[PDB]
Design a protein around this nucleic acid. Structure first.
Ligand SMILES: Nc1ncnc2c1ncn2[C@@H]1O[C@H](COP(=O)(O)OP(=O)(O)OP(=O)(O)O)[C@@H](O)[C@H]1O
Ligand SMILES: [Mg+2]
Lengths: 104, 104, 389, 273, 108, 110
RNA sequence: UAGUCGGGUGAUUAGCCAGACUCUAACUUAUUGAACGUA
């Protein structure tokens, strides 16, 4: 979500971990850390990013830089951005059947 | 609301009582009736109405008797449609009117 | 005809006895007792399980021109009938039709002259059909007295100038007996539930202590786990005292949930904070229902709704879970690990014995110990569009 | 006339009522005269509303079969209209025939013309409508070794060869849609299959597991409790007459039961009643 | 076949040879249709320069991929997905061990 | 004033309105508004006065627009009999339409 | 096993004998209308 938000507009901020539910109930530290590591090919290669939440900050700068690169390059000229998507059981929903005209 | 519903739309079913609030919690009867008489001119000096509501699980469906009020409201609606006629102006104003402040 | 109804009722016909009740002493002490003992008699067999003298359970369904089917017949086994097929055949349409037929039972036990669910003139009639109307005929059974209770939920297609009345009057009559006899003296009513795929939903965050709130949103598909949590908090508040049928209801639901669902071992309510939330001992760790997984949560939101609806709808039954009813489940394998899939029904139909479970599935491993008489099977080639296994 | 009827209610043996429309006397006589003037073709299998052949014969037509099936036409009488009658006549001046034969249950629907159960001429027209229906159904049945009868809203089939009646239901529907367009329709809810493992019975007469007609254990016990009461004279006037009528019915359908009842107590007792 | 029929713009799909709508579609047919068409739309929109936009990149996560799916369909979901999305990274959780039979052990 | 949970299965508020023992829903609406105002002020002042024997003796400025809103005259004639006695050291700035409350206030404070 | 057919005892119940089991009963509507009786 940080990568995604930082592409819509400069300095975006993706979602963060919940405080009530996302932290281990028996954790001796009372905070949860989620340390991801992407590879952007060979040009920029390693890209760390760590989210955190207490019951502690989050180092999200590399994602901000990479998404800023994507955003400025796209603004200057059209490119092919990535496709980040999650599908959970919540995709199991009744067909609403109610179309809406959102005007583009 | 029944007068309004029937003057607006033919067969309109105005607001009904509620099985959850508009029935005395301690009543051997197990139904609530809201009867009311109206007077409209020399002719039809007594237009009755009853809004009835029985709890869930009662043998007789204690039922509103709104036929005469509906008949008068339908007279209003029909004679208005045929020729324009001034109509009643029902309104309600509770303590909720103390609130801050489409051509069709 | 007091004489002919008298003869019928003396034979054992429940409908005639109730009609005699509606004429004599009601503007009698004998026919009221007959009608009430008809719907209240039973015996404890060798297994310690209460068994009705007259069992209420669906017997036949006939889908004429209904969605995919153009004609079909299922002899619902009286007790357990798993319709095993695979997507595209109609195992959900069958439960949808059955729930909409039971909706009239529910509506007319809620109130005489009530109204139940209705087939749709846009999505319930076969598109290839020439009739342009669908007919869910059905027949229930409630003992020697009312051996046949027909119903027919019929609906014509939108735009066709030929309605199709529905024959729900026998349902009105039987539900009238249930409701009136319940009012005069307390009886145990039948439980009706529909747990389709909609019971899987996020754990987002009426009085709930009645007996007729057991029917609220009962044949919609999701149940009401919101109502169960509310009612269980209510029970906890009403039964702390020293630390009473409220206590017994609470214990019954606790044991039911902790027995049907293997991951969940305990469940209680805490308000040491200002929240008043339910704690579940899932996998040996105390958590909240939000923290539960998608298959530990529906496996709870089914059994909890059932136990709730069956403790506060069978008040006089020693073990309310042994009451009667007709419960439809649209995909018993939803979110369940295969090991769980292999013992769902064996335990589901062990604490709710006298309930007719009309279950559906597509996982052949759910039918582990299920007898072949209980399995209805649409052949993959001879698809569901033909009048078992 | 079509509107010359009187409507009323008669109760049901369990719950609810049924609505009947008995014609007027003048049109009653006119339709009787019309029935006498022209006799309508009728099939033998239609063992109902004809001279001699009663319920006993219709039930005995299936006595010597082990597998029984039958279906009930949905809304038999009220479905028949002028179109059905005239199509039947054509397949093998006329406005007054429409007037005499039919009933108008709605004050506005001049064209909503149907037969009523009350009409004395209703049975004849009902039998006439299905003359080719019975022809073809019975021809097919006897081609597959099936005995078929019809007691006026009870189409009964029976056979000894297993797994043959299964195709019969569908057959019926098809033929119906060929004959009476799509107006008269079957009642899929009532269609019943039975064997020598269940409680077969045709038109109220039970068929026991020995290929003989019977009153059923239910009645054989009911009107013998009634007889045991008459033994001590605990009945009433109407109740005694009811017992007499039921004993007469049992004599007609199952004479052996009457003989066994006589042997049970005496002969004079049943002569008295 | 999927198409749009005009005056309310219904989405019609030839399911098992019969033209039904998304309402007249099973709970697994419609859910898989959703999880596929959503990605198709997203990638068509985010890859406007590729001649085959389905070849674009990204990360796609699917929890309980076998949801509302019978065993035969479980056996070929991921393979078709990878065939229409060659380059997308797929992180797929599940609990039914009959989708694994059509993948290399490297990815388990 | 108490909260009755551990009876009735719900949490209800109960008061002794006029010597009764009723639920706060039976209280007059104006009494409810005045109750909410008083409780809010007391909570705020006990939060902001931790080192104090009686936190209600803390300082501050409280403004009240139409202190007699929705209150029956019999309640207006008693509203301000206890504002100062329980909140001595706080400056009250009130506005009002009613003379009945004025029959309890000195001209010095008007 | 279960349902079912219905031979006697006892008195619409209970209860003793037989038996048979196509995937597979569910006893109906009166004054018309047949059929039974009765007069
Ligand atoms: N009105 C209809 N007309 C024609 N076909 C229909 C209609 N409704 C449903 N179908 C059929 O239903 C099929 C889907 O199966 P259905 O939803 O009825 O039950 P299921 O798939 O076995 O169980 P579930 O929906 O829970 O997965 C569609 O392929 C479609 O062919
Ligand atoms: Mg999941």
């Amino acid at each position: 979500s940080w990568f995604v938000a930082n592409i819509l507009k400069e300095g975006g901020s993706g979602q963060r971990l919940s405080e009530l539910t996302d932290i281990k109930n028996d954790a001796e530290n009372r905070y949860a850390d989620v340390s991801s590591t992407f590879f952007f090919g060979k040009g920029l290669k390693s890209v760390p990013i760590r989210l955190s939440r207490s019951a502690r900050d989050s180092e999200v700068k590399p994602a901000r830089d990479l998404a800023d690169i994507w955003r400025v390059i796209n603004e200057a000229k059209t490119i092919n951005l990535p496709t980040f998507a999650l599908y959970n059981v919540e995709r199991s929903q009744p067909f609403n059947r109610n179309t809406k005209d959102n005007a583009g | 609301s029944w007068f309004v519903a029937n003057i607006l739309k033919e067969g309109g079913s105005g607001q009904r009582l509620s099985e959850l609030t508009d029935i005395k919690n301690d009543a051997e009867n197990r139904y609530a009736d809201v009867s009311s008489t109206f007077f409209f001119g020399k002719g039809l000096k007594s237009v009755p109405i009853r809004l009835s509501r029985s709890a869930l699980g009662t043998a007789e469906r204690r039922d509103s008797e709104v036929k005469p009020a509906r008949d008068l409201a339908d007279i209003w609606r029909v004679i208005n449609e045929a020729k324009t006629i001034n109509l009643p102006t029902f309104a309600l104003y509770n303590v909720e009117r103390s609130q801050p402040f489409n051509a069709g | 005809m007091t004489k002919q109804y008298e003869r019928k009722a003396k034979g054992g016909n429940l409908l005639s006895a109730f009609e005699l009740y509606q004429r004599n002493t009601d503007n009698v002490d004998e026919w009221f007792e007959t009608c009430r003992d008809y719907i209240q008699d039973g015996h404890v067999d060798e297994s310690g399980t209460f068994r009705p003298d007259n069992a209420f359970y669906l017997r036949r369904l006939t889908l004429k021109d209904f969605r995919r089917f153009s004609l079909l017949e299922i002899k619902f086994e009286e007790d357990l009938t798993v319709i095993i097929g695979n997507n595209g055949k109609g195992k959900t349409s069958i439960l949808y039709a059955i729930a909409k037929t039971l909706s009239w039972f529910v509506a007319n036990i809620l109130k005489e002259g009530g109204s139940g669910q209705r087939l749709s003139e846009l999505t319930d009639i076969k598109n290839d059909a020439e009739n342009r109307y669908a007919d869910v005929s059905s027949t229930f059974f409630f003992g020697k007295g009312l051996k046949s209770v027909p119903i027919r939920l019929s609906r014509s297609a939108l735009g066709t100038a030929e309605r199709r009345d529905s024959e729900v009057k026998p349902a009105r009559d039987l539900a009238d007996i249930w409701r009136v006899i319940n009012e005069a003296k307390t009886i145990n009513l039948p439980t009706f539930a529909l747990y389709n795929v909609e019971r899987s939903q996020p754990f987002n965050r009426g009085r709930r202590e009645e007996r007729f709130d057991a029917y609220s949103q009962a044949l919609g598909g999701a149940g009401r786990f919101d109502h169960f949590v509310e009612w269980y908090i209510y029970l906890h508040k009403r039964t702390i005292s020293d630390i009473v049928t409220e206590s017994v209801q609470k214990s019954i639901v606790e044991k039911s949930i902790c027995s049907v669902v293997p991951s969940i071992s305990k469940i209680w309510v805490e308000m040491t904070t200002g929240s008043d939330l339910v704690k579940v001992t899932n996998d040996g760790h105390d958590v909240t229902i939000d923290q539960l997984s998608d298959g530990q949560r529906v496996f709870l939101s089914l059994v909890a709704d059932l136990a709730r609806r069956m403790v506060m709808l069978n008040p006089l039954l020693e073990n309310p879970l042994e009451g009667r009813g007709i419960v439809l489940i649209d995909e018993i394998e939803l979110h369940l690990h295969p090991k769980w899939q292999q013992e769902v029904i064996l335990n589901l139909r062990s604490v709710f014995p006298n309930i007719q479970f009309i279950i559906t599935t597509h996982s052949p491993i759910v039918l582990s110990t299920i007898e072949k008489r209980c399995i209805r099977e649409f052949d993959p080639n001879d698809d569901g569009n033909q009048s078992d296994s | 006339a079509p509107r010359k009827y009187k409507v009323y209610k008669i109760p049901k043996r369990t719950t609810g009522f049924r609505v009947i429309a008995q014609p007027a006397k003048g049109l009653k006589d006119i339709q009787r005269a019309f029935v006498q003037l022209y006799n309508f073709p009728v099939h033998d299998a239609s063992m109902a509303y004809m001279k001699g052949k009663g319920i006993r014969d219709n039930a005995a037509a299936h006595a010597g079969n082990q597998y029984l099936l039958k279906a009930d036409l949905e809304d038999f009488f009220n479905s028949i209209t002028p179109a059905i009658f005239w199509r039947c006549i054509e397949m093998s001046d006329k406005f007054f025939i429409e007037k005499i034969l039919f009933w108008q249950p709605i004050k506005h629907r001049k064209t909503k013309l149907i037969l009523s159960v009350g009409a004395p001429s209703s049975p004849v027209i009902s039998n006439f409508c299905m003359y080719e229906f019975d022809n073809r159904i019975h021809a097919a049945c006897n081609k597959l070794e099936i005995t078929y009868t019809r007691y006026a809203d009870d189409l009964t089939f029976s056979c000894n060869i297993p797994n043959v009646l299964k195709a019969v239901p569908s057959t019926i529907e098809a033929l119906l849609k060929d004959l009476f367009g799509s107006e008269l329709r079957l009642n899929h809810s009532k269609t019943v299959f039975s064997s020598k493992a269940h409680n077969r019975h045709v038109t109220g007469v039970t068929i026991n597991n020995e290929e003989t007609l019977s009153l059923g254990r239910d009645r054989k016990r009911f009107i013998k409790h009634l007889i045991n009461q008459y033994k001590y004279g605990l009945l009433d006037n109407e109740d005694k007459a009811y017992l007499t009528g039921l004993l007469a019915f049992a004599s007609h359908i199952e004479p052996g039961f009457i003989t066994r009842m006589n042997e049970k107590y005496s002969l004079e007792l049943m002569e008295r009643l």
